[PDB]
Amino acid sequence: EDIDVILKKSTILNLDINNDIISDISGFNSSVITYPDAQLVPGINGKAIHLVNNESSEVIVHKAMDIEYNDMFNNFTVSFWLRVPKVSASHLEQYGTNEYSIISSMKKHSLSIGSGWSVSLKGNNLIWTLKDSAGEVRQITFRDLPDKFNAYLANKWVFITITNDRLSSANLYINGVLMGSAEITGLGAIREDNNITLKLDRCNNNNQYVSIDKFRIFCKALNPKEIEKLYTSYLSITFLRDFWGNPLRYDTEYYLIPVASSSKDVQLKNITDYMYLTNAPSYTNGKLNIYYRRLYNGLKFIIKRYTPNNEIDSFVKSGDFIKLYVSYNNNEHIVGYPKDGNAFNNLDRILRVGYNAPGIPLYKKMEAVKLRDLKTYSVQLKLYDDKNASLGLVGTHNGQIGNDPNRDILIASNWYFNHLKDKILGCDWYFVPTDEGWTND
């Protein structure tokens, strides 16, 4: 009765991508069929399934003869990481009322009726549906947050967990927290289809695509304690992740956004000079009750490896030594701190972009690490000097420089190693890459 044990024994279906082949590692050996257009993209711990809106993008799981988990009153839980692009205002108008299924165990235009369960979306609403053998149905309807920067169906990898207890209710969990319930008592036996099909069915927006990962099924209704453990077991601090939950790539551009003040953008005063925070502009839409801070404005950064070692991996791993640069005016400028450059209180060292000065050593050795907030897709950058001593973590500091107005200048500081168990710190950075899953309206 160790949670890890329970989670192991209760698993009767578990899909994992290995060798670019989709398979069931549950032990039960369910037949997994993959159609030509079911594509693989990077995901939470390896690769995920990416389904586009076409008949050829489909994955079919044919359950083992023994894998009977929804008999007369048999409790069950279904989990998976989901990632759906941000719906544009226009599509929210044309397709806001369009409910399309993405995962379902219901045989539709046939001899039977809605077999058993389905997961679908209608606008910015995730839906869980249960249908018994007599055609009775219960549903959970989860309405997403208005602030798309902090929403769940707005382009980030989020862990979905739908538990079902026949004596009480079906609960919807997102990232380990309960967001919706529905009393399912009074529902009869569930007479399902032998196949569990992952596919965009009934979607009228040809550009709708979705990614699903770690589709798993349990023969019991997990409780909070078990969902939390399961949820975090996927958060392995191996590779660092970008703002969407995907792996951090080296020679790729990124926009920085301090998690402590997610409304600010990073700006360059002038080439050989410092960087400071600015206010990101906002999109708002009263009619659709949607709004969010615009992304993609501000300096662009690039992570380069410090030295060529053993193997050239494309993903930045927690602990790798790197060099941060900023693409600007068609050149790439190294970020570092000059031997005796400007600094507040003898400690908070001011960071320079492309600082070029004959005879003055520049400190650039950075270390990308995940020191805190494992549930957040953030990064902490550490700067070192020629002797590999720490100049500190990269964060901000408020003050002036010259006749320049008061600003929150990016600095490097060791102070952060004193205040570190806090929920909000300031040395935490989101790495945001341009993604077609997110367009500003």
- Residue 42 — left, alpha, or beta (φ > 0 → left; ψ -120 to 50 → alpha)? beta
Map tokens 């929804």 to a residue. 70
Six-digit token string for 261: 């003040």
Q: Report the SS3 class of residue 73.
A: coil
**Cβ count within 10 A of residue 25:** 14
Instruction: Output the CA torsion 60→66→68→72 (10° steps).
Output: 150
Distance set, CA 296 to CA 42, 75, 150, 431, 432 (Å): 21, 45, 16, 11, 8
| Residues forming a β-bridge with 170 | 164, 182
Six-digit token string for 151: 């929403």
Radius of gyration for the chain, computed over Cα atoms and rounded to the nearest angstrom: 25
**Cβ count within 10 A of residue 383:** 24
C-alpha to C-alpha distance for 441 and 431, rounded to whole angstroms: 21
| Residues forming a β-bridge with 383 | 366, 392
CB-CB contact of 258 with 192 (8 Å)? no
- Resolution (angstroms) equals 2.7
Report the structure determination method.
Answer: X-ray
C-alpha to C-alpha distance for 401 and 394, rounded to whole angstroms: 18
Closest CA to 302 of 319, 322, 285: 322
**Cβ count within 10 A of residue 36:** 10
3-state helix, strand, coil in the chain (%, to 5): 5, 45, 50
Identity of the amino acid at 360: I
Say if residue 161 is exposed, middle or buried (CB neighbours under 10 Å; 0-12, 13-18, 19+). Answer: buried
Domains assigned to the chain: 1-235 (2.60.120.200), 236-441 (2.80.10.50)
Residues in Cβ contact with 428 at an 8 Å cutoff, skipping those fewer than 6 apart:
258, 259, 260, 372, 373, 376, 378, 379, 380
| Helices and strands counted in the chain (H then E) | 3, 33
Residues in Cβ contact with 368 at an 8 Å cutoff, skipping those fewer than 6 apart:
240, 248, 303, 316, 318, 319, 320, 322, 379, 380, 381, 382
Residues in Cβ contact with 427 at an 8 Å cutoff, skipping those fewer than 6 apart:
380, 381, 393, 394, 395, 413, 416
Identity of the amino acid at 67: I
End-to-end CA distance of the chain: 50
